[PDB]
Design an enzyme around this catalytic site. Structure first.
Site, mmCIF file in Angstrom:
data_model
loop_
_atom_site.group_PDB
_atom_site.id
_atom_site.type_symbol
_atom_site.label_atom_id
_atom_site.label_comp_id
_atom_site.label_asym_id
_atom_site.label_seq_id
_atom_site.Cartn_x
_atom_site.Cartn_y
_atom_site.Cartn_z
ATOM 1 N N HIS A 89 0.866 -1.155 0.000
ATOM 2 C CA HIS A 89 0.000 0.000 0.000
ATOM 3 C C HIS A 89 0.908 1.210 0.000
ATOM 4 O O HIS A 89 2.121 1.066 0.110
ATOM 5 C CB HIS A 89 -0.875 0.008 1.264
ATOM 6 C CG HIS A 89 -0.081 0.061 2.530
ATOM 7 N ND1 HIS A 89 0.266 -1.065 3.243
ATOM 8 C CD2 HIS A 89 0.444 1.111 3.199
ATOM 9 C CE1 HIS A 89 0.971 -0.709 4.305
ATOM 10 N NE2 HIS A 89 1.091 0.606 4.299
ATOM 11 N N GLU A 101 6.088 8.881 4.928
ATOM 12 C CA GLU A 101 6.101 8.765 6.395
ATOM 13 C C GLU A 101 7.536 8.912 6.930
ATOM 14 O O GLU A 101 7.814 9.750 7.775
ATOM 15 C CB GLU A 101 5.508 7.420 6.806
ATOM 16 C CG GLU A 101 4.078 7.240 6.278
ATOM 17 C CD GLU A 101 3.307 6.293 7.162
ATOM 18 O OE1 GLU A 101 3.703 5.128 7.247
ATOM 19 O OE2 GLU A 101 2.351 6.731 7.807
ATOM 20 N N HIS A 114 4.897 0.756 0.913
ATOM 21 C CA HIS A 114 5.226 -0.231 1.919
ATOM 22 C C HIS A 114 4.832 -1.609 1.421
ATOM 23 O O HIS A 114 3.661 -1.836 1.140
ATOM 24 C CB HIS A 114 4.426 0.068 3.195
ATOM 25 C CG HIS A 114 4.891 1.301 3.903
ATOM 26 N ND1 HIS A 114 4.129 1.958 4.854
ATOM 27 C CD2 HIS A 114 6.062 1.982 3.813
ATOM 28 C CE1 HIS A 114 4.808 3.011 5.300
ATOM 29 N NE2 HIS A 114 5.984 3.040 4.693
HETATM 30 ZN ZN ZN Z 1 2.175 1.839 5.469
#
Ligand code: ZN
Length: 255
Positions: A89, A101, A114
């Site tokens: 995702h 992130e 990821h």
């Molecule tokens: Zn993630």
């Protein structure tokens, strides 16, 4: 979710581990990461990968793989044992200047991919998340530039899973098309970055970003957090801010 009233800044009230000792993501300070010559090269074996489905789960979209046999596995690097790919995702922003992130010397990328894998010694994904070495997540940064041809099959199906809970068959997708040329990486121990935020992840973050076009990432931003028939909230900025490193060292496979 990720709004002003239920975003990551509120999660600690339902999931106290949000303030734990090994939370993710973190800023990767490239000058204090420790080169570790004992780290092995990553071994990615994705030739027999079997994708099944793509699903909008209200936080992101997941592409799910058959993980009932050792078809697509990650080994080597800092890992002991074999980790099976279960889903991948992305996290992305409302603007090209944010969305990842992890950050690298405070630099944010437009998105972060990821690839989530679980340690086969624990039998299933559900048991693995309860163990300190249960998961390995490969993180790949996306910057905006030239299109990524291997991503386009994903972009084209997003119309069919616009709202939370929608799924679509998604077979014969090859995740090899999403890897950069180099597999040099940083690694540190951390957590899931969405609830339940369990501290079960060995993070492996690749140094080399892949490039995607502005049109490709624009299509991510047309998805919805909400279910069909609910008021429309665009799915953007589904990323958690960097957390304190505390007592951890980030190691690098390269000098
Ligand atoms: Zn993630």
């Amino acid at each position: 979710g990720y709004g002003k009233h239920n975003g990551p800044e509120h999660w600690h009230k339902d999931f106290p581990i949000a303030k734990g000792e090994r939370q993710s993501p973190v800023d990767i300070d490239t000058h204090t990461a420790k080169y570790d010559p004992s780290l092995k090269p990553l071994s990615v074996s994705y030739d027999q990968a079997t994708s099944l489905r793509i699903l909008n789960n209200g936080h992101a979209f997941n592409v799910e793989f058959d993980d009932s046999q050792d078809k697509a596995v990650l080994k080597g690097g800092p890992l002991d044992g074999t980790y099976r790919l279960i889903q991948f995702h992305f996290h992305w922003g409302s603007l090209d200047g944010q969305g990842s992130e992890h950050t690298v010397d405070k630099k944010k990328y437009a998105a972060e991919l990821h690839l989530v894998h679980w340690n086969t010694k624990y039998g299933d994904f559900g048991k693995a998340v309860q163990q300190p070495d249960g998961l390995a997540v490969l993180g790949i940064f996306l910057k905006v530039g030239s299109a990524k041809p291997g991503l386009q099959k994903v972009v084209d199906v997003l119309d069919s899973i616009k709202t939370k809970g929608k799924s679509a068959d998604f077979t014969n997708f090859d995740p090899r098309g999403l890897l950069p040329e180099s597999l040099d990486y940083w690694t540190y121990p951390g957590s899931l970055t969405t609830p339940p935020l369990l501290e079960c992840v060995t993070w492996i973050v690749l140094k080399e970003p892949i490039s995607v076009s502005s049109e490709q990432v624009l299509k991510f931003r047309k998805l919805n957090f909400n279910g069909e028939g609910e008021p429309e909230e665009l799915m953007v900025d589904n990323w958690r801010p960097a957390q304190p490193l505390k007592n951890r060292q980030i190691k690098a496979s390269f000098k």
